Amino acid sequence: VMPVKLAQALANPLFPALDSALRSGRHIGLDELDNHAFLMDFQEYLEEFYARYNVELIRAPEGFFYLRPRSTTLIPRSVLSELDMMVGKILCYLYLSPERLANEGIFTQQELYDELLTLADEAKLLKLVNNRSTGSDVDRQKLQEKVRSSLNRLRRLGMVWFMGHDSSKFRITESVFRFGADVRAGDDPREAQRRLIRDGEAMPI
Amino acid sequence: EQVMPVKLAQALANPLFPALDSALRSGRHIGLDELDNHAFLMDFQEYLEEFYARYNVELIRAPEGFFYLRPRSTTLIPRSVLSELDMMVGKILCYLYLSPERLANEGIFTQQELYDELLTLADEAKLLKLVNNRSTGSDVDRQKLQEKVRSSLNRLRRLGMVWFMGHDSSKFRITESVFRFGADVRAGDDPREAQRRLIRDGE
Amino acid sequence: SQTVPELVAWARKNDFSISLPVDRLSFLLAVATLNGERLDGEMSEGELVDAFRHVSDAFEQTSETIGVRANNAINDMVRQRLLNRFTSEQAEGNAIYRLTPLGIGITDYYIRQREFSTLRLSMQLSIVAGELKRAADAAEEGGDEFHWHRNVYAPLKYSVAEIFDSIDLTQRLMDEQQQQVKDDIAQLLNKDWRAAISSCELLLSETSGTLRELQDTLEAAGDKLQANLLRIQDATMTHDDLHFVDRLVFDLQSKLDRIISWGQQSIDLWIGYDRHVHKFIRTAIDMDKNRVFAQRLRQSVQTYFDEPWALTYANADRLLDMR
Amino acid sequence: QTVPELVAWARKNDFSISLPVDRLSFLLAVATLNGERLDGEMSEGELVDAFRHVSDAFEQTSETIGVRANNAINDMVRQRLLNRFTSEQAEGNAIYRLTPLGIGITDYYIRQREFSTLRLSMQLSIVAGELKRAADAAEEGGDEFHWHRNVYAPLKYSVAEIFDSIDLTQRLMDEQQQQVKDDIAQLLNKDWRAAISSCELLLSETSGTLRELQDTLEAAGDKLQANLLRIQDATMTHDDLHFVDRLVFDLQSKLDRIISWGQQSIDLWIGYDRHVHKFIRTAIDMD
Amino acid sequence: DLVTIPRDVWNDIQGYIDSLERENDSLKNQLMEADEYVAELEEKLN
Amino acid sequence: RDLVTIPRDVWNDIQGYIDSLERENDSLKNQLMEADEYVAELEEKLN
């Protein structure tokens, strides 16, 4: 009928919050002590259950959890635009910045924006922002607002915890390591990208 | 605590459940047509009413036999509200289902009839505001209005009120689930009069 | 939220200002060094001009305008009130120049390398304890107004507050030491990833232990000092003509309480930092022990646009509802 | 022997100070606010409010308040006038304090201190007691640790600070002298006849204070040098105590400077009084 | 009747509320300027 | 660690508030995209 531990866990009053949160994409980091402990105790049976939905449960080596739908899933999937991926990669770097340690892990969006413009080909972001823009102040401000919108979209997924009563700061969680799957392996990024596609991690765009 | 009632587990174990759960949480008005789903719900109604309560959601069976999920202000599952024009289309579909000609047509109607019904029994100015707040009242506006009416009909088909027939989208059949848009007119007067009054009042 | 800018208005009125670029600060430091090296404690204008000669040559300025440049710099220095001039009657235009307290403080902060040490704290602490015990005994004995003024009010005003300020300064030096260690840590990890771990581990614990010892001593002293202040307040409570001593006692109590709370808060902050550091090592220094991951990520972002891509995340459809 | 080493080092480290009127006003407001709160710690949210006050006082734009405030905080931290302690639980997630140089600056502008003989008397008494104890302990003699603790430590960590404070008090009296000169100029240039009496009063009071200071300092210095000579004679019996011998020599030199400063200042003051009275006789009374 | 929440969760909720409010306020002006641009283009075309 | 105690009648408010903001923001996103398409069509018409 049902495994004993699966039945016992399902009755746990903490379950509904997770069940609704995970199927909306939320990644679970180490911070949420109670939720993470619950998942640790009952990983096997939860994985078995969701596998009936035709969706997969993944625990990457870093220690987080996330839901990955397969081709024939019974719950839809979705992706995110290029700008969000860019912001995610930048966030991934800041986590690793050895000079950052003075900041204890708290950051500010001003640094995020300033750093970003040191890498991306200025126009190649402007075109995604506005074709007519060629470094004007107004379009720079427009991009400044677009990055905030992307960051809110990212937080909803669980990559960053906001802090304090002022939005101009935030904290990064270890779930950002996902954005590095491209460079995880030492082989040519292209074949690795196709391998990721085959595994279902990412779809080409 | 009481970990699990036997019947609750037996119900969750039925192989067909997962699709039903995913559809329900999408709000679909599971009805009689799905004889299997209807039977399964009939067997284990009360216990599924009990379980979903933890989500702060009421599993309500309407008088006419169909089932749908109605959450409260404190839902633990995200909820979204559809646009007004969708509600107008829903009400119009409610009216047609009562037409005596349904038996003659076996319930087969084509999008042209629905579009004409909307246009003739709906205010042109309100619709022109709906289609585009900058609309000039020209034809292109009416063509885009037809396009969005088609899109809304598709969304409603996703809700499960109506069925597409064969492999051509031009033919569809209505089911008894449409009353969710007519339960407000449950009074014993003429359905036409009640719907006309509601539409005149803007309700 | 209302405002109180009166002090700012007054300062804007008096035109207080400091302007010490690198060259002027080097000149002032040369003055301080030369003064420290002489046995007479006095400078003729010639010595100042020679020091400015050396400072100017160090920066490679025009050598034909040393005189007027130096004179204009020195006049403004006097204007900014760092130097005080004394017209030695034997040589006009050759006055004797001496530093003011502000200048001495500025120069000392740089030249006098003050390294924190606990023996200083213990000794200062014992001295203040003895002074306060004497003051308390004098207050309890009692006497006329002259007795009070000479034996209670003056000691507290002119000795105790000085020692408490010195202890505060010592804690500020401890702050600077913590900042140095932080910087050190940062750079040390940036040099090499796998090796530095040990060093880091040692550093952290050493600083924590020093903090603990300091805080323990401070509290153990504060108990008795507060008891003595209470004794003095109780002794004064009976006389209605000694409010000035009461205000001073209140100020001393508040200052000591701030001093004590400071150390506990700092220890908590250090524990947080420690934890942070540890976290960092576990999640990042085992994964890319050879630093390849970060460089590859840099390059991938740099050349990203050559082949965009996007990843996937489950997104269940939201529940539809009516009005 | 040439200086350039120190200037080269300072140039290498990029030491510098830059506090124009507005920034200095902000720093003074910071110090004044800090002086009042019982917590002893101030958050960024209060720093921005302090900057808002100064900004309003200077008729500056109110639309760039946050950016300008953050830039000012960065400038301050760069010059080493503040320390930044991250504290997520605090409003703004930051705690700010004053570094030793910041206190040394702000105290002199706000914490006004004027000279008083009793202060010096107390310092002389305490230092005399400490040096007597040190000389006795050294005369007792013992192991190297005995010196390191009971002899070296008092001399290095107690006596020197009191001597430096005595020097600072002398500098304060010098500042008072300068203020007196400016005050006499201001008074005499206003109403000559009506200001001469104040002129004479100021001169007399200044001279009396100077003479009393010098006499007190001589009286104390005799005994202090006696005890320093005692400790030196004691340590010449041991060849392993050069560490203490050099400190003794430096302390003697400091005392010599302190004592000669008083006499030089007194001579300068008598000359100044002579010139002032000649000025009065030749220009004031004549016209 | 009383709910207890960890400090971190409440802080996160408040920060997110403020961020969302700021984003919405900005986007309002963004739409306003876009519509004004459309209106100006239409007026100049005629 | 530290905790915050709140009554339900107050807690429910912020949960409603954030959801309303999210829905309004998404609707505005859609309307802005539609306006963008219109302006693009007008621009290509002009040129």
Author numbering:
A (entry chain E): 9 to 213
B (entry chain F): 7 to 209
C (entry chain C): 5 to 327
D (entry chain D): 6 to 292
E (entry chain I): 4 to 49
F (entry chain J): 3 to 49
Recite the paper's sentences.
MukBEF folds the chromosome of Escherichia coli and related bacteria. The SMC protein MukB dimerizes at its ‘‘hinge’’ domain, which connects via the long coiled-coil ‘‘arm’’ to the ABC-type ATPase ‘‘head’’ domain. The heads are bridged by the kleisin MukF, whereby the C-terminal winged-helix domain (cWHD) of MukF binds the ‘‘cap’’ surface of one MukB, and the N-terminal middle domain (MD) binds the coiled-coil ‘‘neck’’ of the other MukB. MukF also recruits the dimeric KITE protein MukE.
We discover that the gp5.9 protein of bacteriophage T7 blocks this capture site by DNA mimicry, thereby preventing DNA loading and inactivating MukBEF. Recombinant MukE, MukEF, and MukBEF were efficiently pulled down by gp5.9FLAG-bound beads, whereas binding of MukB and MukF was lower or nearly undetectable, respectively. This suggests that gp5.9 binds MukBEF mainly through the MukE subunit. In size exclusion chromatography (SEC), E. coli MukEF and gp5.9 formed a stable complex, whereas little if any binding was observed with P. thracensis MukEF. As observed previously in its RecBCD-bound form, gp5.9 formed a parallel coiled-coil dimer complemented by a β sheet of the N-terminal strands. gp5.9 bound along the DNA-binding cleft of MukE, overlapping along its full length with the DNA capture site. Contacts of gp5.9 with MukE differed from those with RecBCD, as did the precise path of DNA in the respective DNA-binding sites. Moreover, within the resolution limits of the structures, gp5.9 positioned several negatively charged residues (D11, D15, D21, E24, E36, D38, E43, and E45) near positively charged residues in MukE (R140, K150, R163, R164, and R179) or MukF (R322). Most of these ion pair interactions mimic DNA phosphate backbone contacts and thus prevent the natural DNA substrate from binding efficiently. The structure revealed that binding of gp5.9 to the MukE DNA-binding cleft is mutually exclusive with formation of the DNA capture state. In summary, these results suggest that gp5.9 inhibits DNA loading and support the notion that DNA capture is necessary for DNA entrapment. We show here that it inhibits E. coli MukBEF but not P. thracensis MukBEF and that its binding mode to MukBEF is different from its binding to RecBCD.
